[PDB]
Protein backbone atom coordinates (compact mmCIF):
# COMPACT_ATOMS: atom_id res chain seq x y z
CA UNK A 1 0.00 0.00 0.00
CA UNK A 2 2.26 2.72 -1.38
CA UNK A 3 -0.70 4.70 -2.74
CA UNK A 4 -0.63 6.70 0.50
CA UNK A 5 2.72 8.21 -0.48
CA UNK A 6 1.28 9.12 -3.89
CA UNK A 7 -1.68 10.66 -2.07
CA UNK A 8 0.71 12.66 0.14
CA UNK A 9 2.66 14.18 -2.76
CA UNK A 10 -0.58 14.76 -4.66
CA UNK A 11 -1.99 16.81 -1.77
CA UNK A 12 1.27 18.64 -1.05
CA UNK A 13 1.54 19.68 -4.69
CA UNK A 14 -2.17 20.57 -4.77
CA UNK A 15 -2.19 22.69 -1.61
CA UNK A 16 1.09 24.45 -2.44
CA UNK A 17 -0.16 25.56 -5.86
CA UNK A 18 -3.55 26.46 -4.38
CA UNK A 19 -1.83 28.96 -2.07
CA UNK A 20 0.35 30.19 -4.94
CA UNK A 21 -2.68 31.22 -7.04
CA UNK A 22 -5.04 32.34 -4.17
CA UNK A 23 -2.48 34.97 -2.99
CA UNK A 24 -1.85 36.55 -6.48
CA UNK A 25 -5.35 38.22 -6.90
CA UNK A 26 -5.62 39.36 -3.21
CA UNK A 27 -2.15 40.94 -2.58
CA UNK A 28 -2.25 43.89 -5.11
CA UNK A 29 -5.73 45.15 -4.04
CA UNK A 30 -4.94 44.91 -0.28
CA UNK A 31 -1.51 46.61 -0.58
CA UNK A 32 -1.51 49.55 -3.06
CA UNK A 33 5.89 44.32 -6.82
CA UNK A 34 8.01 42.44 -9.33
CA UNK A 35 10.44 41.46 -6.58
CA UNK A 36 7.66 39.96 -4.45
CA UNK A 37 6.38 37.74 -7.27
CA UNK A 38 9.88 36.53 -8.16
CA UNK A 39 10.98 36.03 -4.54
CA UNK A 40 9.27 32.64 -4.28
CA UNK A 41 10.91 31.27 -7.43
CA UNK A 42 14.32 32.84 -6.74
CA UNK A 43 14.54 31.52 -3.17
CA UNK A 44 13.25 28.11 -4.26
CA UNK A 45 15.93 28.05 -6.96
CA UNK A 46 18.75 28.68 -4.47
CA UNK A 47 17.69 26.05 -1.92
CA UNK A 48 17.09 23.27 -4.48
CA UNK A 49 20.74 22.04 -4.48
CA UNK A 50 20.88 22.03 -0.66
CA UNK A 51 17.70 19.95 -0.30
CA UNK A 52 19.11 17.55 -2.88
CA UNK A 53 22.16 16.98 -0.67
CA UNK A 54 20.20 16.90 2.61
CA UNK A 55 17.95 14.04 1.50
CA UNK A 56 21.01 11.84 1.01
CA UNK A 57 22.09 12.44 4.62
CA UNK A 58 18.84 12.02 6.57
CA UNK A 59 16.24 10.63 4.13
CA UNK A 60 13.03 11.96 2.59
CA UNK A 61 10.39 11.87 5.40
CA UNK A 62 12.01 14.53 7.62
CA UNK A 63 12.33 17.02 4.71
CA UNK A 64 8.72 16.31 3.73
CA UNK A 65 7.31 16.86 7.26
CA UNK A 66 9.50 20.00 7.51
CA UNK A 67 7.96 21.20 4.23
CA UNK A 68 4.46 20.87 5.78
CA UNK A 69 5.68 22.73 8.92
CA UNK A 70 7.07 25.64 6.78
CA UNK A 71 3.88 25.72 4.60
CA UNK A 72 1.64 25.77 7.68
CA UNK A 73 3.64 28.65 9.18
CA UNK A 74 3.60 30.53 5.87
CA UNK A 75 -0.17 30.10 5.52
CA UNK A 76 -0.98 31.35 9.07
CA UNK A 77 1.43 34.31 8.61
CA UNK A 78 -0.21 35.37 5.30
CA UNK A 79 -3.68 35.37 6.92
CA UNK A 80 -2.59 37.39 9.97
CA UNK A 81 -0.21 39.93 8.33
CA UNK A 82 -0.53 43.38 6.75
CA UNK A 83 2.98 44.64 5.91
CA UNK A 84 5.21 44.33 2.86
CA UNK A 85 8.23 42.92 4.70
CA UNK A 86 6.13 40.18 6.32
CA UNK A 87 4.65 39.38 2.90
CA UNK A 88 8.17 38.98 1.49
CA UNK A 89 9.15 36.77 4.45
CA UNK A 90 6.01 34.59 3.99
CA UNK A 91 6.45 34.14 0.19
CA UNK A 92 10.19 33.39 0.68
CA UNK A 93 9.32 30.72 3.34
CA UNK A 94 6.78 29.21 0.90
CA UNK A 95 9.64 29.12 -1.66
CA UNK A 96 11.64 27.06 0.83
CA UNK A 97 8.76 24.75 1.74
CA UNK A 98 7.83 24.26 -1.91
CA UNK A 99 11.42 23.31 -2.71
CA UNK A 100 11.41 20.76 0.11
CA UNK A 101 8.06 19.32 -0.99
CA UNK A 102 8.89 19.13 -4.70
CA UNK A 103 12.39 17.67 -4.42
CA UNK A 104 11.72 15.23 -1.57
CA UNK A 105 8.37 14.06 -2.93
CA UNK A 106 9.69 13.51 -6.44
CA UNK A 107 12.69 11.61 -5.08
CA UNK A 108 10.48 9.49 -2.82
CA UNK A 109 8.13 8.73 -5.71
CA UNK A 110 11.08 7.72 -7.88
CA UNK A 111 12.45 5.54 -5.06
CA UNK A 112 9.14 3.82 -4.21
CA UNK A 113 7.94 3.18 -7.80
CA UNK A 114 11.15 1.75 -9.23
CA UNK A 115 9.59 0.33 -12.41
CA UNK A 116 10.08 2.50 -15.48
CA UNK A 117 6.48 2.37 -16.71
CA UNK A 118 4.85 2.73 -13.29
CA UNK A 119 7.16 5.66 -12.49
CA UNK A 120 5.80 7.67 -15.40
CA UNK A 121 2.25 6.49 -14.76
CA UNK A 122 2.33 7.80 -11.18
CA UNK A 123 4.27 10.97 -12.04
CA UNK A 124 1.45 11.83 -14.42
CA UNK A 125 -1.03 11.65 -11.55
CA UNK A 126 1.30 13.60 -9.26
CA UNK A 127 1.81 16.35 -11.86
CA UNK A 128 -1.97 16.43 -12.20
CA UNK A 129 -2.06 17.85 -8.67
CA UNK A 130 -0.28 21.01 -9.82
CA UNK A 131 -2.74 21.45 -12.69
CA UNK A 132 -5.74 20.90 -10.41
CA UNK A 133 -4.35 23.43 -7.93
CA UNK A 134 -3.89 26.12 -10.57
CA UNK A 135 -7.35 25.25 -11.91
CA UNK A 136 -9.22 25.58 -8.60
CA UNK A 137 -7.18 28.28 -6.85
CA UNK A 138 -8.63 31.55 -8.17
CA UNK A 139 -12.33 30.58 -7.83
CA UNK A 140 -11.81 29.28 -4.28
CA UNK A 141 -9.97 32.44 -3.27
CA UNK A 142 -12.59 34.61 -4.97
CA UNK A 143 -15.61 33.03 -3.29
CA UNK A 144 -14.19 32.94 0.24
CA UNK A 145 -12.88 36.49 -0.18
CA UNK A 146 -16.28 37.66 -1.42
CA UNK A 147 -18.47 36.17 1.30
CA UNK A 148 -16.64 35.24 4.51
CA UNK A 149 -13.68 37.61 4.61
CA UNK A 150 -10.07 38.20 3.72
CA UNK A 151 -8.56 35.65 6.14
CA UNK A 152 -11.09 32.87 5.41
CA UNK A 153 -9.28 31.33 2.39
CA UNK A 154 -6.03 31.25 4.35
CA UNK A 155 -7.67 29.73 7.43
CA UNK A 156 -9.37 27.02 5.35
CA UNK A 157 -6.06 26.34 3.60
CA UNK A 158 -4.41 26.08 7.03
CA UNK A 159 -7.04 23.57 8.17
CA UNK A 160 -6.40 21.46 5.07
CA UNK A 161 -2.65 21.74 5.72
CA UNK A 162 -3.22 20.47 9.27
CA UNK A 163 -5.21 17.53 7.89
CA UNK A 164 -2.39 16.80 5.42
CA UNK A 165 0.19 17.00 8.21
CA UNK A 166 -1.78 14.62 10.41
CA UNK A 167 -1.97 12.10 7.56
CA UNK A 168 1.79 12.58 7.07
CA UNK A 169 2.42 11.92 10.77
CA UNK A 170 0.36 8.73 10.62
CA UNK A 171 1.90 7.39 7.39
CA UNK A 172 5.39 8.90 7.06
CA UNK A 173 6.08 9.03 10.82
CA UNK A 174 9.29 11.14 10.88
CA UNK A 175 10.51 9.78 14.21
CA UNK A 176 14.17 8.94 13.53
CA UNK A 177 16.91 9.99 11.11
CA UNK A 178 17.90 7.31 8.59
CA UNK A 179 20.79 7.94 6.10
CA UNK A 180 20.64 6.58 2.49
CA UNK A 181 22.86 3.50 1.80
CA UNK A 182 24.98 4.97 -1.06
CA UNK A 183 26.46 8.36 -2.14
CA UNK A 184 24.52 10.01 -5.01
CA UNK A 185 27.11 11.21 -7.63
CA UNK A 186 27.88 14.97 -6.95
CA UNK A 187 26.19 17.78 -8.88
CA UNK A 188 29.38 18.65 -10.78
CA UNK A 189 29.45 15.23 -12.47
CA UNK A 190 25.75 15.38 -13.36
CA UNK A 191 25.89 18.91 -14.81
CA UNK A 192 28.56 17.76 -17.30
CA UNK A 193 26.15 15.23 -18.86
CA UNK A 194 24.81 16.36 -22.26
CA UNK A 195 21.65 14.20 -22.14
CA UNK A 196 20.58 15.45 -18.71
CA UNK A 197 21.35 18.94 -20.01
CA UNK A 198 19.19 18.39 -23.11
CA UNK A 199 16.24 17.14 -21.04
CA UNK A 200 16.59 20.04 -18.59
CA UNK A 201 16.87 22.53 -21.46
CA UNK A 202 13.74 21.20 -23.16
CA UNK A 203 11.85 21.50 -19.87
CA UNK A 204 13.26 24.99 -19.29
CA UNK A 205 12.38 26.39 -22.72
CA UNK A 206 8.94 24.76 -22.88
CA UNK A 207 8.00 26.17 -19.48
CA UNK A 208 9.64 29.55 -20.15
CA UNK A 209 7.39 29.96 -23.17
CA UNK A 210 4.24 29.78 -21.04
CA UNK A 211 5.98 31.73 -18.26
CA UNK A 212 6.30 34.67 -20.64
CA UNK A 213 2.94 34.06 -22.36
CA UNK A 214 0.72 34.11 -19.28
CA UNK A 215 1.37 37.67 -17.96
CA UNK A 216 2.06 39.32 -21.34
CA UNK A 217 -1.14 38.21 -23.08
CA UNK A 218 -3.76 40.36 -21.25
CA UNK A 219 -1.82 43.57 -21.98
CA UNK A 220 -1.88 42.84 -25.72
CA UNK A 221 -5.54 41.77 -25.47
CA UNK A 222 -6.81 44.91 -23.75
CA UNK A 223 -5.17 47.10 -26.41
CA UNK A 224 -5.78 45.11 -29.61
CA UNK A 225 -9.33 43.92 -28.89
CA UNK A 226 -10.40 46.05 -25.89
CA UNK A 227 -11.67 42.88 -24.17
CA UNK A 228 -13.89 42.92 -21.02
CA UNK A 229 -12.23 41.99 -17.67
CA UNK A 230 -14.11 38.64 -17.46
CA UNK A 231 -12.71 37.57 -20.88
CA UNK A 232 -9.10 38.27 -19.77
CA UNK A 233 -9.54 35.53 -17.14
CA UNK A 234 -11.55 32.95 -19.07
CA UNK A 235 -9.31 33.14 -22.16
CA UNK A 236 -6.40 31.22 -20.59
CA UNK A 237 -8.71 28.52 -19.15
CA UNK A 238 -8.28 26.19 -22.17
CA UNK A 239 -4.54 26.05 -21.45
CA UNK A 240 -5.13 25.01 -17.83
CA UNK A 241 -7.73 22.38 -18.77
CA UNK A 242 -5.63 20.96 -21.61
CA UNK A 243 -2.60 20.80 -19.33
CA UNK A 244 -4.50 18.54 -16.93
CA UNK A 245 -5.88 16.37 -19.75
CA UNK A 246 -2.54 16.02 -21.52
CA UNK A 247 -0.55 15.33 -18.36
CA UNK A 248 -2.97 12.63 -17.21
CA UNK A 249 -3.17 10.84 -20.58
CA UNK A 250 0.44 11.17 -21.69
CA UNK A 251 1.80 9.89 -18.39
CA UNK A 252 0.67 6.52 -19.72
CA UNK A 253 0.80 7.31 -23.44
CA UNK A 254 4.42 8.54 -23.70
CA UNK A 255 6.00 5.15 -22.97
CA UNK A 256 4.48 3.55 -26.08
CA UNK A 257 4.97 6.43 -28.52
CA UNK A 258 8.52 6.87 -27.21
CA UNK A 259 9.51 9.55 -24.72
CA UNK A 260 11.89 11.26 -27.16
CA UNK A 261 9.25 11.41 -29.91
CA UNK A 262 6.60 12.71 -27.51
CA UNK A 263 8.96 15.47 -26.35
CA UNK A 264 9.91 16.33 -29.95
CA UNK A 265 6.29 16.60 -31.05
CA UNK A 266 5.55 18.61 -27.91
CA UNK A 267 8.20 21.21 -28.74
CA UNK A 268 7.08 21.40 -32.38
CA UNK A 269 3.41 21.79 -31.45
CA UNK A 270 4.05 24.40 -28.75
CA UNK A 271 6.26 26.37 -31.14
CA UNK A 272 3.65 26.34 -33.90
CA UNK A 273 0.88 27.34 -31.47
CA UNK A 274 2.93 30.23 -30.08
CA UNK A 275 3.70 31.35 -33.64
CA UNK A 276 0.01 31.29 -34.57
CA UNK A 277 -1.16 33.11 -31.42
CA UNK A 278 -0.50 36.66 -32.79
CA UNK A 279 -2.70 35.90 -35.82
CA UNK A 280 -5.85 35.60 -33.70
CA UNK A 281 -8.42 38.40 -33.96
CA UNK A 282 -10.71 37.59 -31.01
CA UNK A 283 -11.07 35.13 -28.13
CA UNK A 284 -12.54 32.45 -30.40
CA UNK A 285 -9.35 32.69 -32.44
CA UNK A 286 -7.31 32.28 -29.26
CA UNK A 287 -9.19 29.19 -28.01
CA UNK A 288 -7.35 26.66 -30.22
CA UNK A 289 -3.72 27.87 -29.84
CA UNK A 290 -4.00 27.92 -26.03
CA UNK A 291 -5.33 24.36 -26.05
CA UNK A 292 -2.37 23.36 -28.22
CA UNK A 293 0.11 25.10 -25.91
CA UNK A 294 -1.26 23.39 -22.80
CA UNK A 295 -1.40 19.99 -24.50
CA UNK A 296 2.19 20.25 -25.77
CA UNK A 297 3.60 21.41 -22.43
CA UNK A 298 1.83 18.55 -20.66
CA UNK A 299 3.41 16.21 -23.19
CA UNK A 300 6.88 17.64 -22.52
CA UNK A 301 6.63 17.51 -18.72
CA UNK A 302 5.07 14.05 -18.45
CA UNK A 303 7.69 12.69 -20.84
CA UNK A 304 10.70 14.46 -19.31
CA UNK A 305 10.45 13.68 -15.58
CA UNK A 306 10.72 9.87 -15.94
CA UNK A 307 13.51 10.40 -18.48
CA UNK A 308 15.50 12.23 -15.79
CA UNK A 309 14.94 9.31 -13.44
CA UNK A 310 15.95 6.83 -16.20
CA UNK A 311 19.21 8.73 -17.03
CA UNK A 312 20.58 8.62 -13.41
CA UNK A 313 19.81 4.84 -13.21
CA UNK A 314 21.30 4.14 -16.70
CA UNK A 315 24.78 5.67 -16.21
CA UNK A 316 25.08 6.98 -12.63
CA UNK A 317 24.15 5.83 -9.10
CA UNK A 318 20.43 5.43 -8.37
CA UNK A 319 19.89 8.44 -6.11
CA UNK A 320 17.23 10.88 -7.26
CA UNK A 321 17.35 13.90 -4.96
CA UNK A 322 20.05 15.79 -6.86
CA UNK A 323 18.67 15.13 -10.35
CA UNK A 324 15.16 16.16 -9.32
CA UNK A 325 16.71 19.26 -7.75
CA UNK A 326 18.16 19.94 -11.21
CA UNK A 327 14.70 19.49 -12.76
CA UNK A 328 13.14 21.82 -10.19
CA UNK A 329 15.88 24.37 -10.94
CA UNK A 330 14.94 24.07 -14.61
CA UNK A 331 11.25 24.83 -13.80
CA UNK A 332 11.98 27.77 -11.42
CA UNK A 333 14.43 29.43 -13.89
CA UNK A 334 11.60 29.98 -16.41
CA UNK A 335 9.17 31.20 -13.71
CA UNK A 336 11.71 33.47 -12.04
CA UNK A 337 12.96 35.72 -14.84
CA UNK A 338 10.01 35.02 -17.15
CA UNK A 339 7.66 37.96 -16.55
CA UNK A 340 10.32 40.68 -16.25
CA UNK A 341 12.30 39.66 -19.34
CA UNK A 342 9.04 39.21 -21.23
CA UNK A 343 7.88 42.70 -20.33
CA UNK A 344 11.24 44.21 -21.26
CA UNK A 345 11.25 42.48 -24.65
CA UNK A 346 7.60 43.33 -25.34
CA UNK A 347 8.40 46.98 -24.60
CA UNK A 348 11.55 47.07 -26.74
CA UNK A 349 9.94 45.25 -29.68
CA UNK A 350 6.38 44.19 -30.37
CA UNK A 351 4.50 41.39 -28.69
CA UNK A 352 4.24 39.49 -32.03
CA UNK A 353 8.03 39.62 -32.37
CA UNK A 354 8.47 38.17 -28.87
CA UNK A 355 6.05 35.37 -29.72
CA UNK A 356 7.84 34.73 -33.02
CA UNK A 357 11.23 34.55 -31.28
CA UNK A 358 9.92 32.12 -28.65
CA UNK A 359 8.36 29.91 -31.32
CA UNK A 360 11.49 29.93 -33.48
CA UNK A 361 13.68 29.03 -30.48
CA UNK A 362 11.39 26.14 -29.52
CA UNK A 363 11.28 24.81 -33.09
CA UNK A 364 15.07 25.04 -33.46
CA UNK A 365 15.63 23.28 -30.12
CA UNK A 366 13.14 20.53 -31.03
CA UNK A 367 15.60 18.35 -33.06
CA UNK A 368 17.94 18.13 -30.05
CA UNK A 369 15.51 15.65 -28.48
CA UNK A 370 16.56 13.07 -31.09
CA UNK A 371 19.64 12.25 -28.98
CA UNK A 372 17.47 11.09 -26.05
CA UNK A 373 16.37 7.86 -27.77
CA UNK A 374 17.55 4.57 -26.29
CA UNK A 375 20.46 2.75 -28.01
CA UNK A 376 18.44 -0.35 -28.75
Ligand SMILES: NCCc1ccc(O)c(O)c1
Pocket residue numbers: 130134207210214239240243297301
Ligand atom coordinates in the same frame (compact mmCIF):
# COMPACT_ATOMS: atom_id res chain seq x y z
N1 LIG B 1 4.66 23.45 -15.27
C1 LIG B 1 3.31 24.00 -15.23
C2 LIG B 1 3.09 24.87 -16.47
C3 LIG B 1 1.74 25.57 -16.37
C4 LIG B 1 0.59 24.95 -16.83
C5 LIG B 1 -0.63 25.59 -16.74
C6 LIG B 1 -0.71 26.85 -16.19
O1 LIG B 1 -1.95 27.50 -16.10
C7 LIG B 1 0.43 27.48 -15.74
O2 LIG B 1 0.35 28.77 -15.19
C8 LIG B 1 1.66 26.84 -15.83
